[PDB]
Design a protein around this ligand. Structure first.
Ligand SMILES: O=C(c1cccc(Br)c1)c1c(-c2ccc(O)cc2)sc2cc(O)ccc12
Ligand SMILES: O=C(c1cccc(Br)c1)c1c(-c2ccc(O)cc2)sc2cc(O)ccc12
Lengths: 154, 156
């Protein structure tokens, strides 16, 4: 069983690496790193509900959109964490690029990210990204509310 | 090997400290800073301003606990999942948290959120703790209006 666990972890790490380094036109094929029922998406949004893209086909369709609205996106400062689960990885990184979001002025978006990758049978079953949406608000020209700190110590 | 045994031992001990931290609640929070190195850092990495709020030093962490017990009087971490990593001195935690929020100048509220924690260790104690959440949920708990990204132009 330890052999099976070890085997899984090394292959899955390569897939996380490939995902995090997928750039440009290659993003159109990134969904091939998922299971047929794989899910990806953004877990931290203004509404408090995740935005999940469900299914390898819908993920492939969505990459076409992502290529237009984040045309030069790169992940940077990539740190991949294996865990005691050979099928679960976490990634700490930054990301940056132009943001061309429908209905908003073209801007530049930079943020810190955490990604969760869960695997099934050698491919990604669930990818989740977590960030501070306040930085995406700023990139879109949306006013960020400020918590009053006057009464706080520091 | 002897080096592998030392890494296993460090990871097992550090996991116990992460567990203790995550289950520390009530008055015990006043002593949670003893789980840190003398120069340890803790705090909140995701805020409205985009800059972390870092509390630097075991002494300052203990002093800050006094404020934390006033403004989050009954905080609980729930749904705790602890992740060891290939670094015996680096752990991640996925969890939820809940409690009253009693922030100066705001109405008393109830705050619920999802959290990720990072714990880095030195010599058996916490050198750096960092907390990551979506601040929009804390805005809601304080009665602060959350801006809405318009979705009309997006694929549905
Ligand atoms: O930036 C995204 C995004 C980008 C790529 C994938 C995913 Br999933 C989400 C956001 C949205 C989105 C939703 C549906 C789409 O088809 C396209 C974009 S809504 C929204 C609200 C926020 O407060 C912050 C970010 C977003
Ligand atoms: O919740 C906290 C917080 C930060 C660090 C430790 C603890 Br405990 C709580 C926030 C603040 C704070 C700052 C300085 C203090 O001394 C006490 C509170 S400001 C702010 C702004 C946000 O948008 C969201 C959260 C906070």
């Amino acid at each position: 069983e330890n052999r099976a666990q070890v085997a899984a972890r090394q292959h899955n790490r390569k897939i996380v690496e490939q995902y995090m380094h997928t750039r440009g036109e290659a993003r159109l094929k990134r969904h091939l790193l998922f299971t047929e029922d794989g899910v990806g998406g953004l877990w931290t949004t203004d509404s408090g509900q995740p935005i999940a893209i469900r299914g390898r086909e819908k993920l492939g369709e969505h990459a076409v959109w992502s290529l237009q609205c984040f045309p030069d996106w790169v992940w940077t400062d990539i740190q991949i964490f294996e865990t005691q689960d050979p099928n679960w990885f976490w990634v700490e990184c930054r990301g940056e690029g132009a943001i061309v979001f429908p209905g908003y002025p073209r801007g530049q978006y930079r943020n810190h990210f955490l990604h969760s990758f869960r695997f099934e049978n050698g491919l990604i079953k669930e990818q989740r990204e977590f960030m501070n949406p306040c930085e995406q608000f700023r990139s879109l020209g949306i006013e960020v509310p400020e918590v009053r700190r006057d009464g706080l110590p520091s």
